[PDB]
Each structure stands twice: as C-alpha cells, then as structure tokens.
Amino acid sequence: SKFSAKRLPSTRLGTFLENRVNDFLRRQNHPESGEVTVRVVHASDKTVEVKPGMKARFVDSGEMAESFPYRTKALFAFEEIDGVDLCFFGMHVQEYGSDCPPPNQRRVYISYLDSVHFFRPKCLRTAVYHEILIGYLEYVKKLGYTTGHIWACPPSEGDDYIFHCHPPDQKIPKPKRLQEWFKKMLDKAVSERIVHDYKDIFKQATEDRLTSAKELPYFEGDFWPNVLEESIKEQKLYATMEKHKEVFFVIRLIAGPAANSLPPIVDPDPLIPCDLMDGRDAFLTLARDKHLEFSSLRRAQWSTMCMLVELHTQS
C-alpha cells in the first residue's frame, strides 16, 4: 500500500537491521510473528558546543576543541500484525566520526530509545529489541566506530521519550532493571564477538588512568557536561562518577592494536532531512496536536498510519 512502512525509502543501515531481525524471527518459527521493517527516517549534521566553564578552563587554553561534530540518526521499527503496520520501537543516536577531535572520535551514543509494548508474540518482544540494538552495534563496528556509550536513564513519570501516550499498563523500568536489560543485551553481543567488553564509566576512567575532565567524551544532552559545569561553578567529580557509575556503559567494539590502524569512517547512507524526526519534540507535538495516542494496539496502529502519511508526504 501507498503509504506503508515498507515503501519508506531504504538505507543500508535500515536494511541491515531489518534483515537481522527477520532472520532471527524466521529461526524462532513462531506462528504469531509478522514481518519487521526498519527505516532510518532522519539523518543530519550537528555539533555539540563545550559549555562556558569547560570552555573557560580547557577550550580557551587550547587544551580541548570548542565543539564536536556528529551525525544524528532517527530510526523506527515496524511490525506487520494482520496486514496492518505497527510502529513499536524508536531510537535516536549521535555518531562521532573519525574526523571528530578527541576525545569524541569514532564513538556512538544513544540519545533516546522508546517502545510501545504491542509486539506479537509478546514472548519475543525483548529479544527483538536486543536484536535491533546488537545489530546497530554490529553495523557501526563494521564501519569503524570503536566505542559505544549508553546512559541508562528511564523517563520521568508522565514523560514520554518518543511515543505520545504510552499504554496505561506498560510499566516503566527503574534504573536497576534497565541496567540489567542493557547488560543482557551486551552479553549477547559479547558472545557473538561484536562487543569486545563493556565497563562502567568509573572503572573505564580508572583503568585508562585518565588525568583530566578534558579526556571524557563530551556528548549532547548527556549527564557529564552538566556535572562538570556544576563542579566548575562550586575531587568531587570523581565521587559523582563512582556513585552513579552503574548507569553509564562504555562499550568497546574494537580493542587492542587493531583499534589504532583503522581507515577513515565512510558512511554509505545519505543525509535525510525530515522536520518531523529532527529530535524528539516534533513527533510528540504532532501526536499531541492530532490527538494521536500509542495507548492501545489499535490506537497505536491508527497513529502509525498517520505518522507514515506524514513521513511519506512531507517536502
């Protein structure tokens, strides 16, 4: 059909991820599973600017770059259930390439991920989310990104990351459950030899014998930029790192000498301008303004169809 998820334009990344998920589902041979479609719907160039305190201490002194360029991508996963598309998973990532100044070079960071719990069958839902994330790490590792970063931050009560109006009975995991969920994902990646290893931020920083705040990757919207500004306004930083360590993952995709002899990162996919999916706010607002909800299967399917018409006919 004219405005289907499958007819959204393809990318190498979307294709790679959907082939992984569908091959997984085919091996499980569950009669209730439907075809999965994965589409990158936004990609654009951005920069994160170093905030005044760090800018005063380290940028002005020529010890650290003033800003760091990255590519933002938004991708969505859809499942066919009884001939109807359901959008059930979304993710926004920041990708810092090989031209980026240290300490941000060749890193990926997950800005947001969100879901609505209607994947059929339910006994495969978590496994499918893990397959998308492991496939993302698999892909960026293939391109030459060396490290992944994840802040396990659940949304505040009443706050939706990507999808407006979640089901009333979809529980939101607490930090501890969410940490264990990312670990289970990462252990599967480790056994597939995609992830070399992973550590909490304090352990990584300790084992790498990092001297200075300038050595820590500096990402848009992350915790650590704001904690650094607070630290500069008022040794304590080191105490914050340890207390909150368990919620920040540093994921090594490529370690050893092989991590230092890499060609440049060449992303084969074009930029994809799309107003609706540049950041999270725009899609939340359109849902709010069109009275869309993702609060039941049928409402989510209706909202998915509206989302798709919009994606197809913008510009």
Binding region? 113-115, 125-126, 172, 177, 181
115's contact among ligand QS4, ligand COA, none, with CB below 5 to 8 A by partner kind, is ligand COA
Can residue 126 be called a binding residue for ligand COA (CB under 6 A)?
A: yes
| Burial profile 105-138: b = 16 or more Cβ within 10 angstroms, e = fewer | bbbbbbbbbbbbbbbbeeebbebbbbbbbbbbbb
- Read off the tokens for 292: 């869309």
No. of H helices and E strands in the chain?
9, 7
Which helix (H) or strand (E) is 299 found in, with range? helix 297-313
- Count of beta carbons in the 10 Å neighbourhood of residue 314: 11
Per-residue contact track with ligand QS4, 151 to 190, x per CB under 6 A? x-x-------------------------------------
Q: Does 220 bind ligand QS4 (CB under 6 A)?
A: yes
Of 3, 16, 139, 181, the one binding ligand COA by CB under 6 A: 181
Tell me which of ligand QS4, ligand COA, none is bound by residue 220, counting a contact when its beta carbon lies within the kind-specific cut-off of 5 to 8 angstroms.
ligand QS4
State yes or no: residue 115 binds ligand QS4 (CB under 6 A): no
- Is there binding between residue 114 and ligand COA (CB under 6 A)? yes
Structure tokens at 76: 């969505």
Question: At a CB cut-off of 8 Å and minimum separation 6, what does 6 contact?
Answer: 37
Select from 151-159, 191-199, 228-236, 300-308 the region that touches ligand COA (CB under 6 A). Answer: 151-159
Of 11, 33, 37, 115, the residue at the interface with ligand COA (CB under 6 A) is 115
Q: By CB under 6 A, how many residues form the interface with ligand QS4?
A: 8
Dihedrals phi, psi of 287, to nearest 5 degrees:
-60, -50
Question: Residue 155, preceding bond cis, omega within 30 degrees?
Answer: no
Residue list, annotated binding site for acetyl-CoA: 113-115, 125-126, 172, 177, 181
CB of 221 to ligand QS4, least distance (A): 2
Contact range with ligand COA by CB under 6 A, out of 15-23, 54-62, 147-155, 296-304: 147-155
- CA within 13 Å, CB half, 292: 23
Question: Judged by CB under 6 A, does residue 109 bind ligand COA?
Answer: no
As a residue count, the chain comes to 315
**Please, how many CA atoms are within 13 Å of residue 260, restricted to the half-sphere of its CB?**
2
Structural contact between residues 247 and 149, judged by C-beta atoms closer than 8 angstroms: no
Work out what residue 302 binds among ligand COA, ligand QS4, none; the CB cut-off runs from 5 to 8 Å by kind: none
State which residue, 124 or 162, has the beta carbon closest to ligand QS4: 162
Q: Which stretch binds ligand QS4 (CB under 6 A): 63-71, 215-223, 250-258, 298-306?
A: 215-223
By beta-carbon proximity to ligand COA, the closer residue of 161 and 218 is 161
Give the SS3 label for residue 142. helix
Residues preceding gaps in the chain (C to N > 2.5 Å): 234
> Which residues contact ligand QS4 by CB under 6 A?
111-112, 151, 153, 220-222, 279
> Which residues contact ligand COA by CB under 6 A?
110, 112-115, 117, 125-126, 129, 152-155, 161, 171-174, 177-178, 181
